């Protein structure tokens, strides 16, 4: 039935949907394209922020190191970025810029603290993740050009790290109960997954988007009087130029939900 309603939801939309759920209640999975690989766009600002946060551990003053915001450092989308260029955002400032809202140099600083995309990637192995890859820097990481494998993941493996990450024990205490903070904090989700879900539950996501009509989300999700939930939803479309559709994501979503 929910298999059923999602191809449904698929062919309607006329892209590539990837969907997968985690109920931790019971460990059971819902698996919609779960082994393909999509192009992430700035859900993989996640991995990047919770691999600083590890950093964090064994140097607790990490988040209060302030980082120069040049000009030059400038690139597309830079909403908070842009209030401090020729000064200094700290990496905690940079981690809540990029997760809460999207910010894309804010990311190109968390990778460059990494040492760049392959420390992404590093991190991503070290906690078990075999499948997301980090390629590229912002902007270009968001290409999403169908069959190009830089900066992809699948469904099933994002879940599982976002699992790990916000749940398990990939982060200390501390460090999973910010990164929870800050993706409960969004303010890029209401129209993606969450709109999907009812209005009594609670969530935290983080939204991806670029060319293709690529339209992503992956969420942390808190149903009144259930063990939390895992989702990510990824959809791609066949045209460059394609329009987004946080729609199909909350279609997507609200599914699942009917489902559970
Ligand atoms: O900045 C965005 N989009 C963006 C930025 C810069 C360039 C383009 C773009 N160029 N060509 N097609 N899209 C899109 C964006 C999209 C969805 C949510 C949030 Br938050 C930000
Ligand atoms: O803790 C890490 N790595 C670690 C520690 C012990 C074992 C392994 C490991 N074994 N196989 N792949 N990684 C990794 C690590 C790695 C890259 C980035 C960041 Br941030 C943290
Ligand atoms: O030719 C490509 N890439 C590319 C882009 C820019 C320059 C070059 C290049 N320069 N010299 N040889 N190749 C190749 C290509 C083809 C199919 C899928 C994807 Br993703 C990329
Ligand atoms: O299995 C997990 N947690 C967990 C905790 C306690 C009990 C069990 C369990 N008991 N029996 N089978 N699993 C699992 C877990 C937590 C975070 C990420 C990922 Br991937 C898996
Ligand atoms: O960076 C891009 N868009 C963008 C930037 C920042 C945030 C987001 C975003 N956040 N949440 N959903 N989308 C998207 C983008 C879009 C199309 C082509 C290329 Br190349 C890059
Ligand atoms: O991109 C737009 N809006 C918008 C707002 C919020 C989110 C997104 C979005 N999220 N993911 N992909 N697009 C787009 C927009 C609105 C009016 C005119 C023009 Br041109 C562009």
Known sequence: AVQQKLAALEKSSGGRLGVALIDTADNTQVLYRGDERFPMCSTSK?????????????????????????????????????????????????????????????????????????????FARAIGDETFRLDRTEPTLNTAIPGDPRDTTTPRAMAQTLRQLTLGHALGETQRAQLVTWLKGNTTGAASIRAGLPTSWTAGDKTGSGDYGTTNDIAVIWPQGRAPLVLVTYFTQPQQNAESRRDVLASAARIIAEGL
């Open 46 to 122: 996640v991995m990047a922020a919770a691999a600083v946060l590890k950093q964090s551990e064994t140097q607790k003053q990490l988040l209060n190191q302030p980082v120069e915001i040049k000009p030059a450092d400038l690139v597309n989308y830079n909403p908070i970025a842009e209030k401090h260029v020729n000064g200094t955002m700290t990496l905690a400032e940079l981690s809540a810029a990029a997760l809460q809202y999207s910010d894309n140099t804010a990311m190109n600083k968390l990778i460059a603290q990494l040492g760049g995309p392959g420390g992404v990637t590093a």
